Symmetry: D2
Subunit: 480 residues, 4 copies
């Protein structure tokens, strides 16, 4: 029997005679939930409520914003296993990874609670020259206003938290469009937020939306900021059609990793490479897709990495010992299977995996895949790693940069100069030193260059995009 | 009489050749004072390719090298001060006093940039915020965004160029600048100066006045990483929409209000400040004080003194030392202002002074009780026109200040501590001027707007932020042997 | 009425043994409520050796571990709230309402510290400021100073301990705390809390009530890297003189003035805040409002309302919920205040209300026109006494506020924007309280003074600065292969 | 032949009169090259009174006025460059190449100060951190500490004066400078420059060479708010102990080590930097590389190359362009170094080169395996002496670097990422130099030490911090109408 859910319109749970949206268990394929789909009239009402709630949201005391965020943390801790279970069910990610995501969501909301009481301003001297005599300024940050949020399916909770927590920390009302394949996590946040008294009426709406209405989140003039996490072609098109609003984009990647040493040893290096290459089954924007190993270490790394790939448990994501769960859909798995077959046909040497079983794709390692192949050129978003050998470090860095993406990169080195050369020359938002590129701390500036997006997430950085600078220029203030 | 032939700058080099000429007129006499080569499509393509090719050398410059470039600009500006001011008055029509004020502010802009070039600080951040993150730390550092497309206006041909060029050099970003076709000489003088600086890599800069048929390259070209525009709102918003993947910075118009709730420190100084605001570059300013709200108790005294001071303002030859008000940029600009004045009056506005046109000249104008229906009240006038209104409630005056689709700057005259900070909190602008008109700008302050006034901030260190990209080095157990 | 036997903390462990007992009395009844072991010279020597030995493990803690310690303190303070508040009234004599307010502020102090422990940011600095410095960059990071010597007061036995202990744990500094001998129980409650926290290394803390013959170790011992003292000025200044090589932080007395130039927002709220400041913890506060300057136009109205409100203040048993004013710390403290009141009156002061003593109790007192010659005006009274004065000129009132050898905090009630910022600019203090009495303190604000009021600032992030040392890694051509 | 008579600066004015003459000798020839008037007790009293009286005008200067003063100093230093460099070599005995390097660094110091003078940022802080603190916000602003006492050294007569004088002017602090009696001309040259600057208020500065009988006023006078000293540790620590209530900043000696674990980028560059460190100002530097720890695998190659490079160093007339090593400050200084070399060799040290004295000259010396028992190893030599040691374990080398009572700076040569950050974490110093000797200092970096090396940091923006006092304006419901 599918569980019937409510959606959130102007802080209130709504159902009515709205069309039902089926949410399936990504392992069994059974309809596990029925979710109301918002109408055009609902989206219009939600945006009007966000505009109407903006003054009350801006008038909240810093401690009130903190109170809201601290109540979210308490509720997430309380409902931990319930949330982790729902997360595995709608996303198909192993229960261990789902627990890791809830843990990181608690961290995100906690970082936001602490940041909400730390929005510092500046007192600036403005008498920089004789003409400017008797001038001083107070620079203060103010909420941008109503925020349009469009979240993904790969991290249905954490990637929602990275938008929702900064908005509340700043005092911005918001309208969130969760991914239609995974809206349950966002709706649990809606259930939590709905019960928080400090939060003004109309401050939030959480609405799964039809394809014919989805465009309102991009074009509506009442929103002051569009913040999107998802597909690059969709994101870039949204940026082009957004109108006057500010745009924040967290898009795909094709993350490389350089192995120039074993740090601290081979066992730990293999372990971090396995973690990166099969991070959420590769269904991550920072999944380690490309692996560059120095020729002197190549055979040892290839052997150990492939042997460890072969040991990974693929199956029921509800099982505690399951490392690799199914892909989001059978079509996603079919797409990955095609790109593996294509990579092999274009000259790639399959070392392990490459076979499909419904929505499951075996953890795959392909050696010497050319740039011509889609597996090398484009984001795979599956459990596939492309292995390459190098002789020159500067050339390895150049090859790491040989992509239209630019999210994160990884580097294993004991060399001081190699580490800082990589930091200087890698065309990414984050360089991971002595871990794979799939590492992210929820307080770090996270984002990319090139096709990977614009701006940074990470609580205090996302808060910056939701804030507007205002200066009070004071002429001879304090003169009697 | 004989127009001076200028060179344009292609990949750091002065060019002329078999190129079409652009006429630059003296805005007072209407004589062709200068002839400027117009860049071809191939020139713009070559300029952008050179900017891409110069990006690594720009990024590899030492902070002291970027400082030396900026300090050499300051030295050259000081050296050629009067020559630059005279060229500025000639191509823009702004009085010589205002043109000298602009050269002074440009020196300040380049000087603030020189000091900021050696102060691009990074952060050392702890990343072990929770047990799962044990042994993690980060180094957050800022890097140049890459090639920048610059599109500058005609109202401040030098300082509004400086506010884009100086941050780009301070950061180490190569650039291709499209100066306004009506006023490109100021930008070409900077080009002459930059061309002689050895520290600046080859291809680091291009200053190309371009025809309408090629102007779109500055918007759509994928090789540029940032588009920074100052000018007309409808043009700007359209450029933002068609820019593609690049980041966009916009400095657009305004409909700046001012509240007079007290005389600070006295009536004479208030009137004087209200005159500077209302007739800031003949109103041809994005922060020109267009709307004036005076408290009912002060109204008759302010109206009388302000109108009497407007009547004393010298309008004429901008080369004359005592000229306060020069001509508008064109006769069509003046005709447009004249129409909006006539329309404001027809819709119920009471003309207090001025309103008449003489070619490109518009008399300093004050109109009382102009309704929202009139274009003079709804839209940016960009002329020497001030709309006077009376208020009885302060909260209502703040609400009326906010009653616009613009949000650049606002002014407030008050002796009241709470009124001052209420205005700072509730005025929907980028900058609240306390005890001065909204026309005040310090070249180091964060400058920009909300609503249709634009996106992001200029002011050297703030413009540098938009030309920088954040990168974090996440370090796992670094320092463990 | 059996006294409760307490343990002291030596190298993180509860100790008792055959140590001399110190009596801790209930400041209302005068009964011995607690018996506390007094540390020997060998105990202090062992405590300091353990702090030196624990310094590397303290410095090696993850930021999240220091956070966990502080968060566990917050949880325990919340859990034992009423028990702690009751112990506080008992040993200090402050009303239970004020004791509960102190426990709340202590939870705030420890909470701010927990959040600050994960926010110790460093700097990435360019060092190529000139040609000679080519290829240089730096990483500036902050490190724990090392073992800290803490000497805490009796007026805030818990919160003024928290303002030293919480920053030390947030940074990762081991410490040896000497609590006030009249009020050590609050510090020993923190000790039993810390003793149960596993994350905190062995020897990280010691809390030792000491004899007069050994008290000097906290000043002179070379093993301590920082001395942080809150208390009496003559004692503090003498400790600074004899401290040796270590850094010194001093939070000393005050003679806090307040200017009433307007009623903000109204008279009722102004009187309420003036009563709060003037009788803050019975005046036993380093920010107690001792001097009140009222404008001549407001004088009679303020005097009448303030004196009428003083007359309504409930003085008695501090355990009673409706008690506003409790007894002084000792009968000699009350006798001292009584003498200074009699002396102020003898030298020309006009007693408006109070001035009488009943054992350790002093009636809330208001004295008008007390000359500078009198001790009540010249020195810190540390009692429920307010000296009322009239002024005609605001600049003169600010000058009179500054006419003291103290300089902790000052208050100002004004609706005038310029008066507020004139006071901020010219008041010779660490904190200017705008539209509240000088007795206001937020546990995150920079708190401290000028002149005889001390050196440096407390307030979590500011106190953390004094417990940190700057280290730069100067890097030559790092990243060159 | 005839000594040049100089003026001293009393309350901004050049004074001479009937004052006693202080002889300043040419440190190479020993001839009296200059005669300076020595200030009397009354002069010092007048200077301090003028500094107190000038403090309000100093604090009221616009940021641009403080900048103009500093920019005028930079212009004058550039103008008188060779004259200043020659005067420096003459009074200090340092080679002309090093004296020119010092004048360059002084221009950098004053230039960094000019830029910092217009960047004294304050904070806007939310204070509503909890419900009890509702409606509270703060403005944190920094104010000049007041009159400063400056006591400068003889090893850098100009730059180490600049590192006190430039921050004081950048902040707006009046000062009284006691230059070293052996080298006061550099300080007096600054006084001449400063005396002609109109922007600087009357009484803002005094540069007074003072007799031993009057020198104590700089330590004990209550009118000074800060004592900043650079010199001998035992003198400095004694000044800190007797300073009274004022804040104290100390830049004292060192015993700087260097670890050679790799050649970075090569052996030739490594030797060159080691030579620079070991013989930096003839070792008469607080950051002179006194101890060299080389890995056993590199030892014989480093020893051979370093000793061969030492043998090539030109010692002689400091006015000669090719002179690397000049004489010591006095013959007694050289005799002291000679004794410690003889003592080191008697206690088991193996002399590899030098060790001989010729008047005030000490040959560049390298001694192998000197024990901790010897004064050369335990104490600051402050001469051209390097102690060479071999190590097998890196962690042990870091521990041996820390095996000193000083802690100013350390150096490390490494290609290892973890070794570099282990050294940054565990070296007990204020600065770790990576892939250069410890003798490296950028005039903008935080410079200072731990242990006996002093308290606080110099480096313009850091020294400015010590000359500033924090003030918070706590605002209750400001902006509520």
């Amino acid at each position: 029997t599918p569980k019937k859910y409510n959606i959130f319109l102007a802080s209130k749970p709504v159902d009515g005679d709205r069309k039902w949206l089926d949410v399936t268990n990504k392992y069994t394929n059974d309809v596990a939930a029925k979710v109301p789909q918002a109408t055009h009239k609902d989206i219009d009402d939600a945006i009007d409520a966000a505009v109407a709630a903006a003054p009350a949201m801006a008038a909240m005391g810093a401690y009130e914003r903190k109170a809201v965020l601290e109540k979210v943390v308490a509720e997430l801790k309380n409902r931990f296993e319930e949330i982790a279970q729902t997360l595995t069910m709608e996303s198909g990610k192993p229960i261990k990874d789902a627990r890791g995501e809830v843990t990181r969501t608690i961290d995100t909301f906690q970082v936001a609670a602490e940041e909400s009481v730390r929005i510092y301003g500046e007192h600036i001297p403005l008498d920089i020259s004789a003409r400017n005599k008797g001038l001083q300024g107070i620079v203060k940050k103010f909420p941008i206003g109503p925020v349009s949020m469009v979240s993904p399916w790969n991290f249905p909770l954490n990637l929602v938290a990275h938008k929702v927590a900064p908005a509340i920390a700043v005092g911005c009302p918001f309208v969130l469009k969760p991914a239609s394949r995974t809206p349950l996590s966002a709706l649990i946040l809606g259930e939590i937020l709905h019960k928080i008294e400090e939060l003004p009426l109309g401050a939030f709406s959480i609405l799964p939306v039809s394809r014919e209405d989805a465009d309102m989140f991009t074009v509506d003039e009442r929103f002051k900021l569009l913040t999107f996490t998802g597909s690059g072609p969709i994101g870039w098109d949204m940026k082009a059609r957004a109108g006057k609003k500010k745009v924040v984009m967290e898009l795909g990647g094709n993350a490389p990793c350089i192995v120039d040493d074993y740090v601290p040893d081979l066992d730990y290096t293999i372990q971090r490479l396995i973690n990166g290459g099969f991070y959420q089954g590769g269904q991550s924007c920072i999944h380690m897709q490309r692996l560059y190993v120095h020729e002197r270490l190549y055979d040892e790394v290839k052997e150990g990495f492939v042997a460890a790939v072969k040991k990974l448990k693929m199956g029921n994501p509800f099982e505690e010992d399951t490392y690799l769960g199914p892909m989001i859909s059978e079509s996603a798995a079919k797409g990955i299977e095609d790109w593996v077959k294509e990579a092999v046909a274009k000259g790639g040497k399959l070392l392990t995996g490459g076979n499909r079983k419904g929505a499951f794709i075996e953890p795959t390692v392909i050696e010497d895949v050319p740039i011509e192949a889609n597996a090398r050129k484009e984001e795979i978003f599956g459990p596939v790693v492309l292995l390459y050998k190098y002789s020159d470090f500067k050339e390895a860095v150049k090859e790491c940069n040989n992509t239209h993406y630019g999210l994160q990169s990884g580097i294993f080195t004991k060399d001081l100069n190699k580490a800082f050369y990589a930091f200087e020359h890698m065309e990414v938002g984050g360089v991971i030193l002595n871990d794979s590129p799939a590492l992210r701390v929820d307080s770090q500036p996270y984002g990319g260059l090139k096709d990977s997006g614009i701006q940074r997430e990470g609580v205090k950085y996302a808060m910056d995009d939701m804030l507007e600078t205002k200066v009070l220029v004071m002429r001879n203030v304090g003169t009697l």
